[PDB]
Every structure is written in structure tokens, then in C-alpha cells.
Amino acid sequence: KLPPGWEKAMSRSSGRVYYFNHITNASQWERPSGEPARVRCSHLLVKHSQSRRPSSWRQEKITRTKEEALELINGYIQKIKSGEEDFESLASQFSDCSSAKARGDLGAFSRGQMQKPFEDASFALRTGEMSGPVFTDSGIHIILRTE
Ligand SMILES: OCc1cccc2c1OCCO2
């Protein structure tokens, strides 16, 4: 019926149907639209105390909990979706990945090079699409597929 990994859901607060993708954790009101050797993605990483390496250019010792990291991620997604902030701007300022210096761009990559949840979300995103919170051993990601 729907592209890879989409399902119908129902808003608890409005009662209006929406669509959820269980690979990217994206959610939207519209019915989803419509695989390549490679995709190009940017990301914004929020690390937490259980991250593989709980350290970053922003903080020598990352101590926030994983729940706290998810709330930060959720807040960034809200401002990106409202257009109050750009993905690139928030990634430059707040991504715990040193790709913050490149507005979060990771360049292009094939299957097998990234952590599997990141890879699966990246390849399930349509070009221009953004993920919801994506969990890996690094932390929690917002992923933007640029190519
Ligand atoms: O293009 C990606 C990139 C750009 C700049 C810095 C980076 C980085 O990847 C992770 C390591 O730090």
C-alpha cells in the first residue's frame, strides 16, 4: 500500500489519521509519496551518557541522560519543522558529531559503512526528507537525506 515501512496511525489529540515510518521515525499528515547504490546525508547527533564515546567537540564529558538527549532531539525537530530554525544551523551549533563543522554533512555512503539504524533510516528517506529520532550506539540522530 505504502512505501517501505510506512503505516497509518491516529492522532491521539486530533483524531486525524497520519502516517508513521518505523524505519526513519518520520511522521507526517500527508500520505507518503511514491534503491540507489549510495545516498548523501547530513545529521545532527545528540550524545548521551551511554553513547559509545560520551565525548564531543562541544563537551569533554557528555553527562546528559538518554531521555534528556531525546528531548533535545525532539525540540530541534519541532523548530526545524516549524521553520523557526534550519537543520544546517542547528547541526552547526548543537550536533555532538564533529561533522557539525560541515553543517552536519557526512558526504555520500553505501550500505555497510554506517551503523545499521542510521543506514536503514538514511536509505529509507526520500531525497530531501528528514528522519525522526534515530537511535544508534553514538546517540540519537536527526537525519537529512540530501542526495
Ligand atoms: O564529511 C563529514 C565530516 C566533516 C567534517 C568533520 C567530520 C566529518 O565526519 C565525521 C568526523 O568529523
From Swiss-Prot:
SMART domains: WW
A UniProt-annotated Pfam family: Rotamase
Primary location: nucleus
Lineage: Eukaryota, Metazoa, Chordata, Craniata, Vertebrata
Highest taxon above the source species: Eukaryota
Molecular function (Gene Ontology), one example: peptidyl-prolyl cis-trans isomerase activity
Gene Ontology biological-process annotations: cellular response to hypoxia; negative regulation of amyloid-beta formation; negative regulation of cell motility; negative regulation of ERK1 and ERK2 cascade; negative regulation of protein binding; negative regulation of protein catabolic process; negative regulation of SMAD protein signal transduction; negative regulation of transforming growth factor beta receptor signaling pathway
Functional description taken from the UniProt entry: Peptidyl-prolyl cis/trans isomerase (PPIase) that binds to and isomerizes specific phosphorylated Ser/Thr-Pro (pSer/Thr-Pro) motifs. By inducing conformational changes in a subset of phosphorylated proteins, acts as a molecular switch in multiple cellular processes. Displays a preference for acidic residues located N-terminally to the proline bond to be isomerized. Regulates mitosis presumably by interacting with NIMA and attenuating its mitosis-promoting activity. Down-regulates kinase activity of BTK.
PANTHER family for the chain: PEPTIDYL-PROLYL CIS-TRANS ISOMERASE, PEPTIDYL-PROLYL CIS-TRANS ISOMERASE-RELATED
Tissue expression remark: Expressed in immune cells in the lung (at protein level). The phosphorylated form at Ser-55 is expressed in normal breast tissue cells but not in breast cancer cells.
Name this polypeptide is given: Peptidyl-prolyl cis-trans isomerase NIMA-interacting 1
Subcellular location: Nucleus; Nucleus speckle; Cytoplasm
UniProt EC number: 5.2.1.8
Entry-annotated residues carrying Phosphoserine: 55, 92
